[PDB]
Amino acid sequence: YYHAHAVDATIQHEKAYQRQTAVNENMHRPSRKHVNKSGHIRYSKKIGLGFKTPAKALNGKYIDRKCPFTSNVVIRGRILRGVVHSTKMHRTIIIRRNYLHFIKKYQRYQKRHKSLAVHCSPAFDPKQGDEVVIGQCRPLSKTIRYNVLEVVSK
Amino acid sequence: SRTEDVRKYVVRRRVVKSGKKDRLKAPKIQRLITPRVKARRAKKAKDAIAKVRASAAERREYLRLIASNRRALRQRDHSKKHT
Amino acid sequence: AKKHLKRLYAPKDWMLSKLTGVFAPRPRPGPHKLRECLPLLVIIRNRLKYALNAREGEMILRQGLVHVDNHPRRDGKYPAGFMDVVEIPKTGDRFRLMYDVKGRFALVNLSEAEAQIKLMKVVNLYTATGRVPVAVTHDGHRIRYPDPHTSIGDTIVYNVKEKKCVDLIKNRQGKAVIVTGGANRGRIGEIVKVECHPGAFNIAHLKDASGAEFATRAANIFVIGKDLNNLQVTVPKQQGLRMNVIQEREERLIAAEARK
Amino acid sequence: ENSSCVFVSPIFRPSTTKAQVMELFAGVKVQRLRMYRQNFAYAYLDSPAAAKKFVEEKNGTEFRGHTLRVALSARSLEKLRARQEAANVVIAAHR
Amino acid sequence: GIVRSRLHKRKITGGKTKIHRKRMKAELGRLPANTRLGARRVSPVRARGGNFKIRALRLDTGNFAWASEAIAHRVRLLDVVYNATSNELVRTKTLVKNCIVAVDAAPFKRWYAKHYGIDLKASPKLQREWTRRRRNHRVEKAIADQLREGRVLARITSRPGQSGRADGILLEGAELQFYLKRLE
RNA sequence: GCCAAGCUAAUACAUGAACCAACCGGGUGUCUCCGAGACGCCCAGCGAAUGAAUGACAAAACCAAUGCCGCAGUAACACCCAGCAGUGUUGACUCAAUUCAUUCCGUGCGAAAGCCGGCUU
Ligand code: NA
Structure with missing residues (x-):
């Protein structure tokens, strides 16, 4: 007669049970390896390059299989910065990079821009116009190759 | 019989050529085990186990060095703490 | 896939004339990289001048008359490289492959009890089956039980004749190194301070014997001794001392004037 | 050399x-x-003098269940005895 | 044949790419397995590099583990009860990864009595380690309720069309309650 | 471009080596002492699939059981081994590697059941 946990109706509306692969949440005697403040079992990872782990990653409840902090996605390659351009998708944003291009013949500059598709973890809530830091990862979709690592307000 | 020689029972064919001594042709025996090859087979198993024995000795030396280094730190800590 | 090598595409460290032929011998995979190796056919024929052509160079090699690291090699495409010992017992000459101050390959004469050891840089460490530690060196060797204090970047003194490691040199502040790549190849310096940039390359600052200051990537340095006084390996004549081109041009003009 | 105490193996506590041994x-x-060695x-x-090990019962007489082994421990009594009062001076250092 | 390249796709701008190279062997695909319940039948496939893949066509046996007790047993599959992709896979009775199946509960009941001495052991004898490990140990009612029924729900954890095996794990906790609500 | 019958090689194909020969672990039956020991039995190789752990951290009283002379010494461990791993790497890992359970092996794994010389084995 062991009373287990209950289904979290907030985060279970996807026709299949959302669960973290790295850990088993049905353990009667959890160890000290992966335990958050609430005493639950949650897998969290420490990425490199001196990036702090968000609080919602350590003591949250969301399930993301493409998050760089709570999944097997690793960060390697390039680190860039941009401004949020659109947040009309689900866990995806568009960032824009603006720069000046120098034309040698006329000795003058030229305004140019480029658009990138980035995966936004639920640990972050960026608004349009904010500045973000993104890091390169493996192909996560047809167009996505970067992951959000930090957000600067306004 | 299992011990009787077989080199003397091989079939020999005779070829005659005009103005030449007749020659006898016999097949070369295959799968014939000689005391030269019996020592060759048994030799292989000798250094197969010898090589494995050597690696176990190399493992023991490493564990001695690891443990002895770990032991010296305990004595140094206790020597200073007691004295 | 590829099997040939055009002469123009061959590395410039070798001395091959563009007007002599279309092709150059392509080294086989082995201990050293293709772009940082000297094939055995080039050493025998183009440097030692023992073989006039490549037909006579095959007679010498396929007889096993050339020993590399105390082992005969009969392939003219064998990739011999840095810190390698080449011995020909019939002629009684022993060499070591090093870099001169300019950057070219140099053959340094050796003696007995010195042609028995070589220095290897550790590039990787991992755990094998049965929980044994294995270290991979810069020339493909795999040591199955290294010193417990070994780390990546250190130098291991090996004994080719008897096949066990004898000593270990650690990589840190206050040590003698030789640069093996870049624009400062073959220069012997002294580690001053190393900048650590995670994810990117590390930069090491070195000072020469004369006091000249220079920098290079951390992967291009090779520890060879505690300091410039007691080196563990014989170096070429210039001792890794780079000189100005202005003065260099003057002495050769004077020496050649009095040469006759 | 020194003959004060002996080492007894492999008796199991x-x-x-206490009386049987x-x-x-x-x-x-x-x-x-x-007990750590047990x-x-x-x-x-x-x-x-020559101790019980040299005269006999060195390694052959055997004990109940297992063969017995003895040797000279090279430890006397008055040293570990002396440290007790040295340890008694700290037993009273704090109340 | 089948390809896995992006040359036939539209650009993000909606335009069309002009392909100027033939199809390469390095980007091929293969037809699925469509594994089903039944007597064992597999076929090997030679993959790139000379390796082999076991394309299973029918299976009826697998290895299922009780995670709470850290044990495992070889049992027989009884039915397919749920599939997240489409219930037409439940009708056709196909076996894929993460599908929900019902397995034989007899071997797990026997191990339960042999270990913890509970029957849902002819002579007690000196073996009284039952009380030694029965302390601080409880079994959820949901697992025990279906153990005595004869079958227990499980989740397939292996890819049958890539390795030729149907291995799984028994549902417990919140995952069990999630699927029991949909099935009703 | 082809068919049938009759001969016979292998480093082609197939099958297959017990004792010499160790260290260590898990589960279980009959004996002795008062929980300890002995014995018998099943399984314990490289690689593969699944599940569970390891893959670090960064001021005193009371009770039950324990180590040492009543709490000062104090790597750990019920004998043969009293230091025979308490310590993998990276910027970062669900990676390397180790232990337990089931299938393994139902894709695989010969000492080529191999060939030459020199000394007398
Ligand atoms: Na063969």
Whole structure:
């Protein structure tokens, strides 16, 4: 007669049970390896390059299989910065990079821009116009190759 | 019989050529085990186990060095703490 | 896939004339990289001048008359490289492959009890089956039980004749190194301070014997001794001392004037 | 050399009582059984001279269940005795 | 044949790419397995590099583990009860990864009595380690309720069309309650 | 471009080596002492699939059981081994590697059941 946990109706509306692969949440005697403040079992990872782990990653409840902090996605390659351009998708944003291009013949500059598709973890809530830091990862979709690592307000 | 020689029972064919001594042709025996090859087979198993024995000795030396280094730190800590 | 090598595409460290032929011998995979190796056919024929052509160079090699690291090699495409010992017992000459101050390959004469050891840089460490530690060196060797204090970047003194490691040199502040790549190849310096940039390359600052200051990537340095006084390996004549081109041009003009 | 105490193996504390070991082996000055080894005992002899090990029962007489082994421990009594008052001076250092 | 390249796709701008190279062997695909319940039948496939893949066509046996007790047993599959992709896979009775199946509960009941001495052991004898490990140990009612029924729900954890095996794990906790609500 | 019958090689194909020969672990039956020990039995190789752990941290009283002389010494460990791993790497890992359970092996794994010389084995 062991009373287990209950289904979290907030985060279970996807026709299949959302669960973290790295850990088993049905353990009667959890160890000290992966335990958050609430005493639950949650897998969290420490990425490199001196990036702090968000609080919602350590003591949250969301399930993301493409998050760089709570999944097997690793960060390697390039680190860039941009401004949020659109947040009309689900866990995806568009960032824009603006720069000046120098034309040698006329000795003058030229305004140019480029658009990138980035995966936004639920640990972050960026608004349009904010500045973000993104890091390169493996192909996560047809167009996505970067992951959000930090957000600067306004 | 299992011990009787077989080199003397091989079939020999005779070829005659005009103005030449007749020659006898016999097949070369295959799968014939000689005391030269019996020592060759048994030799292989000798250094197969010898090589494995050597690696176990190399493992023991490493564990001695690891443990002895770990032991010296305990004595140094206790020597200073007691004295 | 590829099997040939055009002469123009061959590395410039070798001395091959563009007007002599279309092709150059392509080294086989082995201990050293293709772009940082000297094939055995080039050493025998183009440097030692023992073989006039490549037909006579095959007679010498396929007889096993050339020993590399105390082992005969009969392939003219064998990739011999840095810190390698080449011995020909019939002629009684022993060499070591090093870099001169300019950057070219140099053959340094050796003696007995010195042609028995070589220095290897550790590039990787991992755990094998049965929980044994294995270290991979810069020339493909795999040591199955290294010193417990070994780390990546250190130098291991090996004994080719008897096949066990004898000593270990650690990589840190206050040590003698030789640069093996870049624009400062073959220069012997002294580690001053190393900048650590995670994810990117590390930069090491070195000072020469004369006091000249220079920098290079951390992967291009090779520890060879505690300091410039007691080196563990014989170096070429210039001792890794780079000189100005202005003065260099003057002495050769004077020496050649009095040469006759 | 030095002959004060002997080492007894492999007697087991959970199987043999205090009186049972005293019967086979005579320890006059001191006697103690060690549990971390669980096969070690330290008994001191008043007048061992050549000790009980050299005369006999070295490695052949065997004890109940297992063969017995003994040797010269090269430890005397008055050293560990002396440290006790040195340890008694700290037993009273704090109340 | 089948390809896995992006040359036939539209650009993000909606335009069309002009392909000027033929199809390469390095980007091929293969037809699926469509594994089903039944007597064992597999076929090997030679993959790139000379390796082999076991394309299973029918299976009826697998290895299922009780995570709470850290044990495992070889049992027989009884039915397919749920599939997240489409219930037409439940009708056709196909076996894929993460599908929900019902397995034989007899071997797990026997191990339960042999270990913890509970029957849902002719002579007690000196073996009384039952009380030694029965302390601080409880079994959820949901697992025990279906153990005595004869079958227990499980989740397939292996890819049958890539390795030729149907291995799984028994549902417990919140995952069990999630699927029991949909099935009703 | 082809068919049938009759001969016979292998480093082609197939099958297959017990004792010499160790260290260590898990589960279980009959004996002795008062929980300890002995014995018998099943399984314990490289690689593969699944599940569970490891893959670090960064001021005193009371009770039950324990180590040492009553709490001062104090790597750990119920004998043969009293230091025979308490310590993998990276910027970062669900990676390397180790232990337990089931299938393994139902894709695989010969000492080529191999060939030459020199000394007398
Ligand atoms: Na063969």
